[PDB]
Amino acid sequence: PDAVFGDRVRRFQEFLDTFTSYRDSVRSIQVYNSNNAANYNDDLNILPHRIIISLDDLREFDRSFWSGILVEPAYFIPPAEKALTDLADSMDDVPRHPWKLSFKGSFGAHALSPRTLTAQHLNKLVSVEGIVTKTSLVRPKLIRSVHYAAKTGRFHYRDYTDATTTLTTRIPTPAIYPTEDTEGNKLTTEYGYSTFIDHQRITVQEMPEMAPAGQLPRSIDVILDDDLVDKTKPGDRVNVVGVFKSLGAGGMNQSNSTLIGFKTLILGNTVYPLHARSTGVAARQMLTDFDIRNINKLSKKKDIFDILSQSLAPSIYGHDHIKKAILLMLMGGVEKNLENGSHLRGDINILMVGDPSTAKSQLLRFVLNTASLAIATTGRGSSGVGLTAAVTTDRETGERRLEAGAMVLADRGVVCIDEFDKMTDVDRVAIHEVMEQQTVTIAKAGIHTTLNARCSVIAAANPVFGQYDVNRDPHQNIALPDSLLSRFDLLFVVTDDINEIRDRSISEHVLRTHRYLPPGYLEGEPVRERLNLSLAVGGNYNGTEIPKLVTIPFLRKYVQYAKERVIPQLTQEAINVIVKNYTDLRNDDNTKKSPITARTLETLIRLATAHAKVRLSKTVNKVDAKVAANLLRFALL
């Protein structure tokens, strides 16, 4: 027993007393585990025994203890964990693993980067942001081994600890694996009674958006334990909160005698997968009951399909039907997985083609900025292996492995392809399978696999003559294969027609856009840039809290709520409308920009389903079918 350890335990007990959010979070975890255990006993998931602790509240309570965790975490984190474990055991008397801590809040000088991590931050709690590059295989580490002596019929056990388990270094006592007891009888290892804890080691290097553009990047190893494994994948942007520790002796023993120095790594306490632009982490955000009530209130209005669409990009004049299409693509439709293995698309693909300076790249950048999982690519910039997948070799195992391209990483997301017309032929053959069958089939040397690539694709292209010509046929203007055009659900030809009143309207809209101030900025002060990192849980300017037009953070809340909550089903009253309109479209005499196939019918079904998602309606109504048809006739005629 140590007096200062007990004093710090009592101080953290007072801290947990004055803030009850940690108390009823512990209640929530315990009642979830107990209810799952009772359901398993009568008729599942087990939450980890760890609690997020806010450093700001701790600084408000005790500045000395907060500075102790930040500066000397090895002396302050274990007393806090013991206090949390004692509190949990005191409130689990009526209904065994020790409770761990996790940290959120401002870190100040300890919010660092793998370049900025130096030896002055050793034995300190650091928050390090970066990109995950190498992710080791999750390996079980033996904690306690259980053995059986058949001659005595007795079960024995041995506990094992290493330097990474504990923040405070103790005497290394290597207890070997017992195969004979103290009487000499042979021991049989009891697999299944021994305990194993998952262990992982990830490599976090500095973000390419924040690394210097010339030189090599810096990386650090992070050790993760049983509940923190498999929270990241290579390519994720991450924030790791943990203790920066040094291990071993840096050649200062006789046996070691080399200048690796002291091996340095981060004992991970908290892993936040951050969402960045064009990455594999989807932006997910908390829906407060006020926002849910607001979403349900706007769901009841009749003009909502014209409010959400016009509030997409108010900085672009016109292109209203493209806004409708982008909104319906963000809604995403409903896919059908059948009992006989057949798959039907839900995702909606948009192709835009036409003259330059028609806000195509701007719309693609907006879709990149507003979607949860949008990934931006370019025709000649990416290749066939760039979009789908490629093959590499693992250093440890020595066997071939896969690197996921843009299409696999944007699964359940949006792929924004800029300058679609300049893609290579093998890339087109690759995207043919992805854009309909929703899969990437890899048949390379030795490995055969399929990867899920369920993606909405929005693409911008140019005509082969540079400007679209009215009198020429659309087949010569597009110059893309008919199967690829049939892949796209909506094809919008945008032409920069010159009219005096239209030109005046564009000019005034552009100038009113060009006379904007952010709040809290001066007349001559230049606007600053902060890189948008969002935590992934689980022409009027004054659009604020649903007045006339919807702000973008609420619009993505609406999109999130509609994608997670409502899954509409077809009704006959919409089906007759869709069937009649598809029959009219197949046999109409009017020349259309896009060919009419059986994919037009499923386009109609997906568009009606997306519009039903807009209204938050569990059934597809007739007005949904009418508006889904009328959006398609604008694209075709």
Binding site: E500, D503, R504, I506, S507, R515, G524, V527
Partner: protein
């Protein structure tokens, strides 16, 4: 001659220009005045009206196009001129010389196109 002109003050040194452009970019980001918007809109519709009637008479598309990106180009030139004198707001005199420079750069290039001329 350049040293004498630098001593007089009608030319400034290259390092002084470098640090002055650094200070201007980190300090001033001007705006268009509301009275300068009407002139920009009027001239941006007159040029495109001229191109429209020229394309209608010639029945052939012009080889050098004039678009909304050119309007924002003129805006950017005006705001650069206003950033020269560290002016938080751009007056009419910046707009006028931005127009004259746009005439000397893109409009004479378009007049070199026979489709863009014919007037």
């Amino acid at each position: 001659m350049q040293n004498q002109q630098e001593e007089n003050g009608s030319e400034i040194s290259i390092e002084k220009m470098k640090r002055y452009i650094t200070y201007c970019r980190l300090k001033c980001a001007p705006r268009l005045s509301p009275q300068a918007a009407e002139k920009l809109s009027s001239n941006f519709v007159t040029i495109r009206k001229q191109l429209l009637i020229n394309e209608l008479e010639s029945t052939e598309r012009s080889s050098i196009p004039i678009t909304i990106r050119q309007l924002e180009a003129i805006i950017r030139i005006t705001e650069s001129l206003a950033k020269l004198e560290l002016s938080p707001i751009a007056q009419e005199r910046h707009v006028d010389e931005a127009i004259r420079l746009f005439q000397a750069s893109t409009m004479d290039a378009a007049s070199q196109d026979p489709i863009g001329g014919l007037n």
